[PDB]
């Protein structure tokens, strides 16, 4: 009773904290709030996954209904057993082939997503969309437009995007100062296919561990 | 100390000898950008980094993290690391350390692979070698 | 039954290994375990013991060791105060 009503306000607790935004309303009933704020707000600690205080047993997810059953890592998919055995609703294989797939072909191979120091998987999360996202931030760059989005845009080949004219009056993108586009800052004769422009960088090892040779263990 | 631009040597008060490396995601950014734009100005960080800033501001405040590269435990407390481009004209540059309780030891980067493959297999042998002797000595007791 | 066994193993592991936070443990009880284990390792490794000896600058090293031993008990602060 008295101890329950003795609690300091969470904002009174914020001042003790160097990173006050992590502390939350429920920290008021922390039996040792001044300590718990220091631990929770300590540098490298990773806050408890928030699926607690929910009674849903951490997975009720509607998204769980729509998750793909599985996908082979493409290196293993090269092994062709996908066609040999149909998992969806005998296939003689070579020892050298499989062994080389894991070792010769797949030594340097690593899953593309993984996760980071403090990455924690909440129920509603799905990594796959973020994998295509990270891969997409990689492939796609300004000045280039795929033929699909080009067809939807109804832009014929050899013709500049509609924002090149408004970009002539307004100016180059503030975010891309080094961006070049045919007809304006960049040679129109170099206009080719899906690329109407490219960023021209103005910036222009061994890491003590350079192996200088790569030799995998041989099965034979 | 520094081995390189992107990697660091460090010891512990408790005797750990480790080496860390900045992630390639950071090396691309600093290689492709000027430092003046880091504090203020436009530097485009992938979506995950920012979400780690608002999600975990305490750990990711520095917006990148060292992936552990090498870790080791030498029961001494290392006083001085020195990175020598060559040890007695040897090609592979070593790093030699003197410990407080006194010791001097080295970490030699292994070129190629089957160097560390053969070394790794030998270390794996000598690791449980006492157990292999115990299992042989056990089987001979089963026969006797 | 299973949880009930985990209670008994809680009593046994707590007996052997001393401080193990069960469910509710006061910060005074737990921080004492922290201090005791940290000092325990500082004096336990001849390495870190040699280190603290020099950085502290004591005349002998066993002064630092038995210092840590004494520093494990709470009343040692008031003991130093009474010197």
């Amino acid at each position: 009773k008295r101890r329950k009503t003795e609690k300091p306000s969470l904002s009174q607790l914020k001042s003790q904290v160097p990173y006050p935004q992590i502390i939350e309303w429920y920290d008021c009933d922390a039996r040792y709030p001044g300590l718990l704020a220091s631990i929770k707000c300590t540098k490298n600690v990773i806050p408890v996954p928030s699926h607690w205080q929910s009674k849903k047993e951490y997975l009720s997810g509607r998204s769980l209904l729509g998750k793909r059953p599985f996908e082979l890592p493409d290196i293993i998919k090269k092994t062709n057993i996908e066609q040999m055995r149909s998992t969806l609703p005998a296939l003689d294989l070579d020892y050298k082939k499989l062994h080389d797939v894991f070792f010769k072909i797949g030594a340097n191979w690593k899953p593309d997503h993984l996760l980071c120091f403090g990455d924690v998987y909440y129920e509603n999360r799905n990594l796959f969309e973020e994998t295509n996202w990270k891969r997409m931030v990689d492939h796609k760059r300004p000045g280039r437009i795929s033929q699909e989005l080009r067809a939807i845009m109804n832009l014929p080949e050899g013709q500049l995007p509609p924002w090149c004219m408004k970009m002539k009056d307004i100016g180059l993108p503030t975010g891309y100062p080094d961006l070049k586009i045919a007809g304006l800052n960049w040679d129109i004769t170099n206009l080719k296919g899906d690329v109407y422009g490219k960023i021209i960088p103005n910036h222009h090892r061994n890491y003590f561990g350079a192996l200088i040779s790569f030799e995998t263990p041989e099965f034979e | 100390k520094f081995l390189d631009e992107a990697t660091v040597i460090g010891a512990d008060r408790y005797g750990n000898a480790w080496t860390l490396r900045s992630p390639p995601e950071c090396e691309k950014i600093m290689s492709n950008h000027d430092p003046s734009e880091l504090s203020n100005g436009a530097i485009k960080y992938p979506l995950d980094v920012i979400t780690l800033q608002q999600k975990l501001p305490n750990t990711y405040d520095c917006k990148f993290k060292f992936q552990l590269l090498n870790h080791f435990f030498v029961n001494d407390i290392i006083t001085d690391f020195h990175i020598l481009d060559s040890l007695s004209n040897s090609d592979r540059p070593g790093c030699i350390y003197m410990g407080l309780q006194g010791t001097v030891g080295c970490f030699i980067p292994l070129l190629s692979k089957g160097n560390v493959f053969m070394m790794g297999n030998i270390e794996n042998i000598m690791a449980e070698a006492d157990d292999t002797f115990y299992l042989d000595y056990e089987s001979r007791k089963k026969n006797n | 039954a299973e949880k009930q066994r985990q209670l008994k193993l809680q009593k046994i592991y707590k007996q052997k290994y001393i401080g193990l936070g069960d469910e509710s443990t006061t910060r005074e009880q737990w921080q004492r375990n922290v201090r005791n284990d940290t000092l325990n390792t500082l004096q336990g490794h001849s390495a870190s013991l040699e280190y603290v000896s020099l950085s502290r600058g004591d005349l002998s090293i066993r002064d630092t060791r038995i210092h840590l031993l004494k520093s494990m008990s709470p009343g040692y602060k008031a003991y130093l105060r009474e010197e």
Binding site: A210 | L3, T7, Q101, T103, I108 | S46
Partner: peptide, 29 residues
């Protein structure tokens, strides 16, 4: 892609000199 993965080879050139324990017995003849 080349894996960085620095492979370090630890050697103790000179062995720890602070002598923490001793015994007086006669071991080998």
């Amino acid at each position: 892609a080349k894996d960085d993965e620095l492979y370090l080879y630890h050697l103790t050139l000179k062995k720890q000199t602070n002598f923490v324990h001793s015994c007086i017995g006669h071991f080998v003849d």
